[PDB]
Amino acid sequence: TLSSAMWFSWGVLLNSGIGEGAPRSFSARILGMVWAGFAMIIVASYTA
Amino acid sequence: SFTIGKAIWLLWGLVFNNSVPVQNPKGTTSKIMVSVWAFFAVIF
User: What region, left, alpha or beta, does residue B24 occupy, with left being phi > 0 and alpha being psi -120 to 50 degrees?
Assistant: First the structure.
C-alpha cells in the first residue's frame, strides 16, 4: 500500500480528490490527523 | 466510462472549491495532471 500512502500526502496538501486511500492502523491515524492540520496552517498563512 | 464531457465537469468543480461529487480518472498520467490542475486552482 506504499503507492496509496504516497498519494495521500499530495491529495491532502493540494485540496485535490485524486486517490481514495486512508490509513487503517490507529497508531498511524493520529499523526495523519495533525498532517491535515499542517495543511491549513501553511496555505491560509500564505494567502494572508 | 470516461467521456470527453465528464472531464470539464470535474475540472470546473475543482477550480471552483471542489464540492460536487465527480468521477476521477484511472491512469497515472491523468492523476498527475489533475494534481497539477489542483495546484493551479489553489493558487488562482
Answer: beta
